[PDB]
Amino acid sequence: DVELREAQRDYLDFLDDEEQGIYQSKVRELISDNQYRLIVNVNDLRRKNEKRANRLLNNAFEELVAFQRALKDFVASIDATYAKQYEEFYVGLEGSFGSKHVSPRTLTSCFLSCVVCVEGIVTKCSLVRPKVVRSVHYCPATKKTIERRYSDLTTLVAFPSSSVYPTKDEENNPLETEYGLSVYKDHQTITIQEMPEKAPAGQLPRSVDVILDDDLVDKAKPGDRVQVVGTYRCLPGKKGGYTSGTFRTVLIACNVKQMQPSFSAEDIAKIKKFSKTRSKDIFDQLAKSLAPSIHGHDYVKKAILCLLLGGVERDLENGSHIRGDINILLIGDPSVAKSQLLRYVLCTAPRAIPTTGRGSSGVGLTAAVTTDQETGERRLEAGAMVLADRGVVCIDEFDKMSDMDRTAIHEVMEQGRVTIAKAGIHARLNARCSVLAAANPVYGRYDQYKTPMENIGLQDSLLSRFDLLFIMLDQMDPEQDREISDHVLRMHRYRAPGEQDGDAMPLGSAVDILATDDPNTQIYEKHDNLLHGTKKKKEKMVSAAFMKKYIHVAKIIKPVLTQESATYIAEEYSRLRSQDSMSSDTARTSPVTARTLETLIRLATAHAKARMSKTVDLQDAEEAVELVQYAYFKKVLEK
Amino acid sequence: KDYALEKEKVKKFLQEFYQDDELGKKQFKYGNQLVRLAHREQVALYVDLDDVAEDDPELVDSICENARRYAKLFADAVQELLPQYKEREVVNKDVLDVYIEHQYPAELMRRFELYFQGPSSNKPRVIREVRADSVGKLVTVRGIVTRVSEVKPKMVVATYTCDQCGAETYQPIQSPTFMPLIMCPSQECQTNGRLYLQTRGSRFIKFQEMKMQEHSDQVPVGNIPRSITVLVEGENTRIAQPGDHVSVTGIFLPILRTGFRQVVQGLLSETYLEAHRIVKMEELRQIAEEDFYEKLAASIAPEIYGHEDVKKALLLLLVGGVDQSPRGMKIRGNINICLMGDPGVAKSQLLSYIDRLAPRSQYTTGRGSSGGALVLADQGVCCIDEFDKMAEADRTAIHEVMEQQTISIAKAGILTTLNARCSILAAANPAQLPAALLSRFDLLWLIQDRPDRDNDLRLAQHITYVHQHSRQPPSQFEPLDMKLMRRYIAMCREKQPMVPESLADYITAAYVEMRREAWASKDATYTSARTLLAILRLSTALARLRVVEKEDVNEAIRLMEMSKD
Amino acid sequence: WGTDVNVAACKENFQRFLQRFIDPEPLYMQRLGEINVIGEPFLNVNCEHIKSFDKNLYRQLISYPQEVIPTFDMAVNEIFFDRYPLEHQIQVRPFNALKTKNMRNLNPEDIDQLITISGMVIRTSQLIPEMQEAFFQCQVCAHTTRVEMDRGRIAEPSVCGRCHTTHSMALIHNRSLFSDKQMIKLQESPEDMPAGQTPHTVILFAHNDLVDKVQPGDRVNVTGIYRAVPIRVNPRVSNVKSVYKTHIDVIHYR
DNA sequence: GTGATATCTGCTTTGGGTGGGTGGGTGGGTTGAGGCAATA
DNA sequence: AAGCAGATATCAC
Numbered sequence A: 001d002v003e004l005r006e007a008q009r010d011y012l013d014f015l016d017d018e019e020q021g022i023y024q025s026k027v028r029e030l031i032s033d034n035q036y037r038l039i040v041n042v043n044d045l046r047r048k049n050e051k052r053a054n055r056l057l058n059n060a061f062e063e064l065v066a067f068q069r070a071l072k073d074f075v076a077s078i079d080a081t082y083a084k085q086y087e088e089f090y091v092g093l094e095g096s097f098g099s100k101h102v103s104p105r106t107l108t109s110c111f112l113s114c115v116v117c118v119e120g121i122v123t124k125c126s127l128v129r130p131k132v133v134r135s136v137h138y139c140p141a142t143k144k145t146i147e148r149r150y151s152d153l154t155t156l157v158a159f160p161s162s163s164v165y166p167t168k169d170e171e172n173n174p175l176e177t178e179y180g181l182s183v184y185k186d187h188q189t190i191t192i193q194e195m196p197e198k199a200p201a202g203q204l205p206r207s208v209d210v211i212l213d214d215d216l217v218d219k220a221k222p223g224d225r226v227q228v229v230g231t232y233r234c235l236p237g238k239k240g241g242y243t244s245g246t247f248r249t250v251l252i253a254c255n256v257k258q259m260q261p262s263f264s265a266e267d268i269a270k271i272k273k274f275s276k277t278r279s280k281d282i283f284d285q286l287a288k289s290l291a292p293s294i295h296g297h298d299y300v301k302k303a304i305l306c307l308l309l310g311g312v313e314r315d316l317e318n319g320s321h322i323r324g325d326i327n328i329l330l331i332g333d334p335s336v337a338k339s340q341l342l343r344y345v346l347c348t349a350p351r352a353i354p355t356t357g358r359g360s361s362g363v364g365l366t367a368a369v370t371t372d373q374e375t376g377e378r379r380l381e382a383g384a385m386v387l388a389d390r391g392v393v394c395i396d397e398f399d400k401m402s403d404m405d406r407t408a409i410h411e412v413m414e415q416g417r418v419t420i421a422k423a424g425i426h427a428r429l430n431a432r433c434s435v436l437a438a439a440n441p442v443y444g445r446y447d448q449y450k451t452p453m454e455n456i457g458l459q460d461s462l463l464s465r466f467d468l469l470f471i472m473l474d475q476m477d478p479e480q481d482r483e484i485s486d487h488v489l490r491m492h493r494y495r496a497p498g499e500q501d502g503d504a505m506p507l508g509s510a511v512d513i514l515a516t517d518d519p520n521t522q523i524y525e526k527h528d529n530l531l532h533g534t535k536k537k538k539e540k541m542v543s544a545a546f547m548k549k550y551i552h553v554a555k556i557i558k559p560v561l562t563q564e565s566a567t568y569i570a571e572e573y574s575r576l577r578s579q580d581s582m583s584s585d586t587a588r589t590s591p592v593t594a595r596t597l598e599t600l601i602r603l604a605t606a607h608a609k610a611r612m613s614k615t616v617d618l619q620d621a622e623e624a625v626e627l628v629q630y631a632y633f634k635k636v637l638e639k
Numbered sequence B: 001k002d003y004a005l006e007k008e009k010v011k012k013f014l015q016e017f018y019q020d021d022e023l024g025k026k027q028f029k030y031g032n033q034l035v036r037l038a039h040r041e042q043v044a045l046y047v048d049l050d051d052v053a054e055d056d057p058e059l060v061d062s063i064c065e066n067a068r069r070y071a072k073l074f075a076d077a078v079q080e081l082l083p084q085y086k087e088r089e090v091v092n093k094d095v096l097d098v099y100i101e102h103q104y105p106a107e108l109m110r111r112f113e114l115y116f117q118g119p120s121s122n123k124p125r126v127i128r129e130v131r132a133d134s135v136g137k138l139v140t141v142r143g144i145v146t147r148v149s150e151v152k153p154k155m156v157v158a159t160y161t162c163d164q165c166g167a168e169t170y171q172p173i174q175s176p177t178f179m180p181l182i183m184c185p186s187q188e189c190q191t192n193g194r195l196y197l198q199t200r201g202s203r204f205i206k207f208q209e210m211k212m213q214e215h216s217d218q219v220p221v222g223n224i225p226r227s228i229t230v231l232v233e234g235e236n237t238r239i240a241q242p243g244d245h246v247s248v249t250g251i252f253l254p255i256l257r258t259g260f261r262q263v264v265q266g267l268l269s270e271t272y273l274e275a276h277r278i279v280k281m282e283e284l285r286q287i288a289e290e291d292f293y294e295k296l297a298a299s300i301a302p303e304i305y306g307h308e309d310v311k312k313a314l315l316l317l318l319v320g321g322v323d324q325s326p327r328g329m330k331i332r333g334n335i336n337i338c339l340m341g342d343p344g345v346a347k348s349q350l351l352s353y354i355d356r357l358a359p360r361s362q363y364t365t366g367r368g369s370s371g372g373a374l375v376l377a378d379q380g381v382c383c384i385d386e387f388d389k390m391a392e393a394d395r396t397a398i399h400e401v402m403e404q405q406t407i408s409i410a411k412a413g414i415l416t417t418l419n420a421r422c423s424i425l426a427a428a429n430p431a432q433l434p435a436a437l438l439s440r441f442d443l444l445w446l447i448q449d450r451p452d453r454d455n456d457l458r459l460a461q462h463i464t465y466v467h468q469h470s471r472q473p474p475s476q477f478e479p480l481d482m483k484l485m486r487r488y489i490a491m492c493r494e495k496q497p498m499v500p501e502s503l504a505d506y507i508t509a510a511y512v513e514m515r516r517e518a519w520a521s522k523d524a525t526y527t528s529a530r531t532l533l534a535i536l537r538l539s540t541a542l543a544r545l546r547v548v549e550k551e552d553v554n555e556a557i558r559l560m561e562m563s564k565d
Numbered sequence C: 001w002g003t004d005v006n007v008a009a010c011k012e013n014f015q016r017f018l019q020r021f022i023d024p025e026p027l028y029m030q031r032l033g034e035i036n037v038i039g040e041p042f043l044n045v046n047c048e049h050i051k052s053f054d055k056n057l058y059r060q061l062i063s064y065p066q067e068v069i070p071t072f073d074m075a076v077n078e079i080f081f082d083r084y085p086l087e088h089q090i091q092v093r094p095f096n097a098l099k100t101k102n103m104r105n106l107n108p109e110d111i112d113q114l115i116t117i118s119g120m121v122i123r124t125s126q127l128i129p130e131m132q133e134a135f136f137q138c139q140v141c142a143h144t145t146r147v148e149m150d151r152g153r154i155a156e157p158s159v160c161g162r163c164h165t166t167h168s169m170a171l172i173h174n175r176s177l178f179s180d181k182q183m184i185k186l187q188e189s190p191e192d193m194p195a196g197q198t199p200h201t202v203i204l205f206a207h208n209d210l211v212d213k214v215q216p217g218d219r220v221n222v223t224g225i226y227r228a229v230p231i232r233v234n235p236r237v238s239n240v241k242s243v244y245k246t247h248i249d250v251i252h253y254r
Numbered sequence D: 001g002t003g004a005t006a007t008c009t010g011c012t013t014t015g016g017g018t019g020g021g022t023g024g025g026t027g028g029g030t031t032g033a034g035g036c037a038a039t040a
Numbered sequence E: 001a002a003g004c005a006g007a008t009a010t011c012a013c
């Protein structure tokens, strides 16, 4: 009572700060941008009133009610009409919560009625449904209107109000609902699961249930990595006047954050200068910098850079489509770093979905039906390739996938669409992704005296659907062995600067993020003797963060093909296709088709993107032709 | 607000609103319809909110905020105005009127319906943007119809009669469920009977339930399309079918639970859209007069290069040949084509084009669907991609369609036959499909791409231009748009040309010539008696483009021999 | 009842129809003679003939079949017993030669009206017994009573007449009187189907001698009354859904 | 004053996963992935 | 919310 009034007074004092002005300005912006939720940083509250912050974090529901009442009063003070516009104003929290930073494993009963910040992966989402807040009813006979308020266990002030609408007045005269005058709010439920890398040994990850209401709905979709700030509550229930004493617990969100680069003017200037510095060296340097811990497979790295940059998809006025996504296949001998390159792309690309041939199915790749959590409605859940829409799917052990499962990949690889015709569902799903696949030859170890087609053991149509195919061979050469051995041993000797000698990597880890914003760019990575060697360092390495920003900026450019590039590409395609037995030893790894011409155009466009050029010039076309020439032919040894 | 003033204002708008008609230039748009409703030549009245906006935008805003209220207000205004607009007696009185002639709720005598035609200022939404802030408001939503229900009767007013006192009782209904009355409430029965529902004295309305879906191109990245439920009543029924693209104006409302299920369920509710308006979404002679066959064929997928004769064959599959014998007996006209070739020769692009052009069609893949598309493609085209990837069960279905033009199903011994009168356009990669299936195709085209410098140079020049400009390189004759190509195809299909007696000997001479070559070739050609019937089928299709003449037989012959190479 | 049907006038009109109508000896007089010769007490009447002779009688037959057909039965019985002084009295079966409706166009305005539709039989049920007269026996004195069914409801006795005990009358199910009923599923004909739509299906109910008169696979024209029946929310409650289900009470098979 | 007979009160229902898999699938719930035997 | 089982006070004869 008196404590609630004092808390409301304190919160009103906190938001009226013109006498530094951060929250007075924030509320003005809230009004201007047509919002009804203000995000408050608990660090400022802690600075100005420590006791009020501790109470807010430890007695969450009452303190949040007082905070929201104070916010409504303040907004009304700035502008009364706007305050009348909205039923309620909400408060979200951010900053550092100390020990309240938890995961779904560490979120225990001791955090009940507290504000917590949870970090995890979204596994399940639900449909948005309306929830009645205030009901308005009219009496035609008596010409008067009556209002009703509803609340449940999920509201800030929990009370189990009745769901039945009024139907008649105290007088027998009947009542009719004014739906356009009533108030409803959106409601959704999600599940957040522990990050698998953080789980203890042998343990499947734990999960927690979260409730999103109002604006927070649809802020997260399955597959996202999120940070949710909310309040922890138990939902007690009874049946037949009996309670089991065991209660479900939910997190009632007040803020949802994602874990889209943010660009400062200095970074933009750095990117522009980097693009301007060299004409031909940008692409080569970027490709050299891709996966530093792997000794060079230089052409493969250039191809992977092209895949990350991509081409430009064409939409024609008639409605026909030409894809811009570049697909790559790597077939190789054991232990040539195929899986490591796939893992690097998984770690670096903005949207990358891992998959194994033996551990995946067509259903799991495309989409699955099941009963809706509510009403038991036949609903669809996205598979790997739909989750990878406008992203990358990395398929390891591609040769192990079943033929029937493999066939489901053709339509996505070529057209970019998934057709679902099952369980009384007819849908066309967008799966516009780039496929990066790794495989072994039929005999495990490539037989140089057999032909590429006999070693690869795949149908010509599937091979045709791949923009580039790379045969990676392990040839015992003493000089190459020396270089690779030096690189590998240097990698294994490395010790990160923070760690001490003798330290062992733990299996699992506690929560390390202690704030919503990370308390912690340079173009070139700082030289390390072990990571780079004692060589004179003539070749410089671009840093990971700068590479991530630069590739993001370049992916948005759409280079336009020019007449000279088109002429060169056409002539080179004619030469590639006409040439039969161009070298008598030489054999074609994949057939040359009009898809090869489209691949040339795609690679040239990606190269032009790397330079941040608005036009595709002859140098880009030459690079694409060089890549295709390297990839499409292999010498066959004669015994 | 006091609703009496609003009712008076609605009456005013209905009465004195006049709009410049095409000819009259001053007509009362809604007074005439009120006259028609009074005389019962019309059932449904559609109020366009643009007209209301012209006079007073505030009332349009009020209607859009609280639409279900203003629907009742407009209905009451119309019901009160109807007597004043009546001129003569109603010509014909049906069962309800006879019952009436032989207190009543105001809705028992109502025989019209009132709907709103949403304002042009309210731009349409996708099903996602219809959220909790729209509950009880008038919104316009776009989508694809995926399911429709048979029209059924829904009770609006239930009428009872007491067996003892013979009085009449009425029970207006405004819920998905209701509580029937049992015991008579009349004074006579109360001072000292059972109520029984009288179907003849009750008022029903046509009812229909349908599901809508989001357009694929509008779904956000990495999401699944959402769906909404639309409830349709009265004169808005039988408008939407599965597959059509519709724009639905209606009211977004929650579904009312009933019984103990009110108590158990919390504050959450399911929703639906209450439908108010459903909207489905001599130069010409000169184009038909000269070289029109070459022009139309060249217009098939202009972004593809070099498949001139295949494109000509696909045009015949679109017109489809004559369906009747000279005496009116039904015969099979549908033409089946299979494109066999090596990868990357635009087979899938050509099939994708034909699906978009065909008015009724279904595109399927060898493994994208199994164990239905044929039924939806009845009287249409079924594009079967990856034709050699299907299972035996799928193969048997296709075989029976090319034979009987029907699909037979057996639900645990309960047989049923569905119409499958569709054309089959198949694409396959050479390995091994059974010969029993290949001989059924009228045209078997083997697309082989042998490398050649000049042709490869020309193809590359075409493709690079398309990537450079997002359209085909210019040619002497401009391709025709799909909107315009579907008109000529439909117009041609109306004709039913016949083959004369005279050509009998000539067509026979061609058949033996084809047979002799097949025996001499010693290849696996499928020239049989079935080939003779194929000459007639193609010949009549060619005429339907242009009574069959010798020039159509020559083109049909040439197209076929070019196919067998 | 909201019907402009005078029973006596309808009966007189139909007797006049049987007496005077001539097919272009009255036709149905010959039919009655053939009925006597054969012994099957069913008279089929073509609605087109009734329309030609009398347009009011036809209009009333179509609008109120339930009320009007029994008067036709009374008329035919009276006339037949005059001309020829049979297990049961003769029953009229009006029919339309051609279908007057499509299964896809059935509307609420057609409820409780005589209609004809064409279709193909797909399923028939096993026989369903319907109680017509209930049989009660006192569990104390063995006194027996019979109660006539009334609109699907039975008035269970509360006290035995002979011994006045209360709540002692038990219904003896197998001493009651039952009649036959059959459920049939009719599928829309392939010809009338719009292009690319799945066939519609309708439920028909046949009674007494019309049961087992069609088999799955048959193509039939069915003349009957269109009915609308309420659907209970669940078996325990008396709540009903606002949307009614429909079927056809079969009167004539062709 | 006894025999109905009319009014009032408390129980539990629903299909549902906080009501179990130590109730049972002959009491009743689509979709997919995973072992078998027979299969080719 | 809807309906059956049980309890019980109440009119009527």
Ligand SMILES: Nc1ncnc2c1ncn2[C@@H]1O[C@H](COP(=O)(O)OP(=O)(O)OP(=O)(O)O)[C@@H](O)[C@H]1O
Residues within 6 Å of the ligand: A293, A294, A295, A296, A332, A333, A334, A335, A336, A337, A338, A339, A340, A439, A440, A484, A487, A488
């Ligand atoms: N060129 C290389 N540079 C650096 N490390 C390498 C190189 N080749 C192999 N390695 C290391 O050797 C091991 C090779 O295993 P990896 O899974 O990458 O091989 P792979 O080519 O995918 O084999 P497989 O076909 O058997 O799955 C990894 O530790 C990888 O780091």
Ligand SMILES: Nc1ncnc2c1ncn2[C@@H]1O[C@H](COP(=O)(O)OP(=O)(O)OP(=O)(O)O)[C@@H](O)[C@H]1O
Residues within 6 Å of the ligand: A322, A414, A461, A464, A594, A595, A598, B303, B304, B305, B306, B341, B342, B343, B344, B345, B346, B347, B348, B349, B350, B429, B459, B463
């Ligand atoms: N003649 C051509 N003109 C224009 N584009 C062509 C031509 N041939 C092939 N292409 C292009 O090649 C790409 C592959 O074509 P498509 O997928 O239709 O081949 P396909 O014959 O169906 O192959 P598959 O047998 O492998 O399924 C498409 O972009 C198509 O536009």
Ligand SMILES: [Mg+2]
Residues within 6 Å of the ligand: A338, A339
């Ligand atoms: Mg590997």
Ligand SMILES: [Mg+2]
Residues within 6 Å of the ligand: B347, B348, B385
């Ligand atoms: Mg294809």
Ligand SMILES: [Zn+2]
Residues within 6 Å of the ligand: C138, C139, C140, C141, C142, C143, C160, C161, C162, C163, C164, C165, C168
């Ligand atoms: Zn007795």
